[PDB]
Enzyme design. Structure first.
Site, PDB file in Angstrom:
ATOM      1  N   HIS A   1       0.848  -1.196   0.000  1.00  0.00           N
ATOM      2  CA  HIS A   1       0.000   0.000   0.000  1.00  0.00           C
ATOM      3  C   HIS A   1       0.886   1.251   0.000  1.00  0.00           C
ATOM      4  O   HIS A   1       1.132   1.833   1.067  1.00  0.00           O
ATOM      5  CB  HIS A   1      -0.919   0.012   1.237  1.00  0.00           C
ATOM      6  CG  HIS A   1      -1.821  -1.185   1.347  1.00  0.00           C
ATOM      7  ND1 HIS A   1      -2.654  -1.591   0.324  1.00  0.00           N
ATOM      8  CD2 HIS A   1      -2.064  -2.026   2.384  1.00  0.00           C
ATOM      9  CE1 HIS A   1      -3.352  -2.647   0.719  1.00  0.00           C
ATOM     10  NE2 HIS A   1      -3.009  -2.931   1.967  1.00  0.00           N
TER      11      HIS A   1
ATOM     12  N   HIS B   1      -7.424  12.055  -8.992  1.00  0.00           N
ATOM     13  CA  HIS B   1      -8.105  11.068  -9.792  1.00  0.00           C
ATOM     14  C   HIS B   1      -9.598  10.920  -9.485  1.00  0.00           C
ATOM     15  O   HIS B   1     -10.310  10.293 -10.251  1.00  0.00           O
ATOM     16  CB  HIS B   1      -7.451   9.674  -9.598  1.00  0.00           C
ATOM     17  CG  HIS B   1      -6.023   9.638 -10.024  1.00  0.00           C
ATOM     18  ND1 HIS B   1      -5.627   9.974 -11.304  1.00  0.00           N
ATOM     19  CD2 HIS B   1      -4.896   9.282  -9.356  1.00  0.00           C
ATOM     20  CE1 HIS B   1      -4.313   9.821 -11.402  1.00  0.00           C
ATOM     21  NE2 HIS B   1      -3.847   9.408 -10.237  1.00  0.00           N
TER      22      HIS B   1
HETATM   23 ZN    ZN Z   1       0.654  10.324  -9.335  1.00  0.00          ZN
HETATM   24 ZN    ZN Z   2      -4.073  -4.161   3.099  1.00  0.00          ZN
END
Ligand code: ZN
Ligand code: ZN
Ligand code: K
Ligand code: K
Length: 383
Positions: A27, A153
């Protein structure tokens, strides 16, 4: 030069947005990103020079200036809020993903902490909104928002790419509500196209969006933001995609970005004449990001210089917000460089030897394509 006219925004609220699997290794958009930046700012003695702010949570109304009511209730509320919501909305949230690591997600990359992610995301957005409002009111000169999760995004009703609410676009809209007819420039130097930002302002001549991003003919996340995308209707001309084509070989870095600034960013920006400049300040075009996460070699000084150039616009009203970029040393170096520049440090473009080098031919080609498209709309681009 007036003291305390540069704001910093940070708060430990934003650290709590973490997968339940408890592993920063699967992550990359992790709490350590903003903590390391924060402390570096303190170490090198920049924090003391700035009006520090905590931020706050965006209101659901603030969120809805960009995002759908359904998106806002999904990501902006919690079971079980002290919230006064009608039963029709409550029933809607009853109608409504597992990750490999066992945590909950919106998609593979985009994690959701069931306790903490809503507060963190709202806080990122309200922090950028608040820092910006201060600059708009002329009560600070410029400033830097040390925020996560990222924003650029997230579209009207889509969380993706580590993002839930488009903090920069929300600040933009809010600012415009509070000062009629103001013109806002958003510069996005994160290595990814800010699809949600481009879509938010696509038909809107009051906001000029300039993104620099690795594009490679539609084959780098998110696939969006081709050079021919200029805006539509009233907003035709006010969306500028510096879509870099051609890959990682040859080396994409400082001469390309400086050239992109000299030739496209600054001349179009001055012609636009923005009342304020918001920067989607991702640092993933920094050296320290392998192929799939970027593959570029922009330096901290260059981010610093780019910041410095943007300060010649809008009377100096400039607000950076953290977007992407996860190499800690790279993001801390770049954040430091940017904050010195905000304060009024000047970079010596002659100091750097590698800045004598010509931009690569892919960069030239890519910029030629920008010029060709944007000649239709901008005088500085004509001929
Ligand atoms: Zn980026
Ligand atoms: Zn995770
Ligand atoms: K970008
Ligand atoms: K626009």
């Amino acid at each position: 030069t007036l003291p305390f006219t540069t704001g910093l925004i940070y708060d430990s609220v934003m650290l709590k947005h973490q997968c339940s699997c408890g592993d920063n290794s699967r992550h990359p958009e992790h709490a350590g990103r903003i903590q390391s930046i924060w402390s570096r700012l303190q170490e090198r003695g920049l924090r003391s020079q700035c009006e520090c702010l905590r931020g706050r949570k965006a209101s659901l109304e603030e969120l809805q200036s960009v995002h759908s009511e359904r998106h806002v209730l999904l990501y902006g509320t919690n079971p079980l809020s002290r919230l006064k919501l009608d039963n029709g909305k409550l029933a809607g949230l009853l109608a409504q993903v597992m990750l490999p690591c066992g945590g909950v997600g919106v998609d593979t990359d985009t994690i959701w902490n069931e306790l903490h992610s809503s507060n963190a995301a709202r806080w990122a957005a309200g922090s950028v909104t608040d820092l910006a409002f201060k600059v708009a009111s002329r009560e600070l000169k410029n400033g830097f928002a040390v925020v996560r999760p990222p924003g650029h995004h997230a579209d009207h009703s889509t969380a993706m790419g580590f993002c839930f609410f488009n903090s920069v676009a929300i600040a933009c809209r809010q600012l415009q509500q509070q000062s009629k007819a103001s013109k806002i420039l958003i510069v996005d130097w994160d290595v990814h196209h800010g699809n949600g930002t481009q879509q938010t302002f696509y038909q809107d001549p009051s906001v000029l969006y300039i993104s620099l991003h690795r594009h490679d003919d539609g084959n780098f996340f998110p696939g969006s933001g081709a050079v021919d995308e200029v805006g539509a209707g009233s907003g035709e001309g006010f969306n500028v995609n510096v879509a870099w084509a051609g890959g990682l070989d040859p080396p994409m870095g400082d001469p390309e970005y400086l050239a992109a600034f000299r030739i496209v960013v600054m001349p179009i920006a001055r012609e636009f004449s923005p009342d304020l400049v918001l920067v989607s300040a991702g640092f993933d075009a920094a050296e320290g990001h392998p192929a799939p996460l970027g593959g570029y070699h922009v330096s901290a000084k260059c981010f610093g210089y780019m910041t410095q150039q943007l300060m010649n616009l809008a009377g100096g009203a400039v607000v950076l917000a953290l977007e992407g970029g996860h190499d800690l040393t790279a993001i801390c170096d770049a954040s430091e460089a940017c904050v010195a520049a905000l304060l009024g440090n000047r970079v010596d473009p002659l100091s750097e030897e590698g800045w004598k080098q010509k931009p690569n031919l892919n960069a030239i080609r890519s910029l030629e394509a920008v010029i060709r498209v944007h000649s239709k709309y901008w005088g500085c681009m004509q001929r």
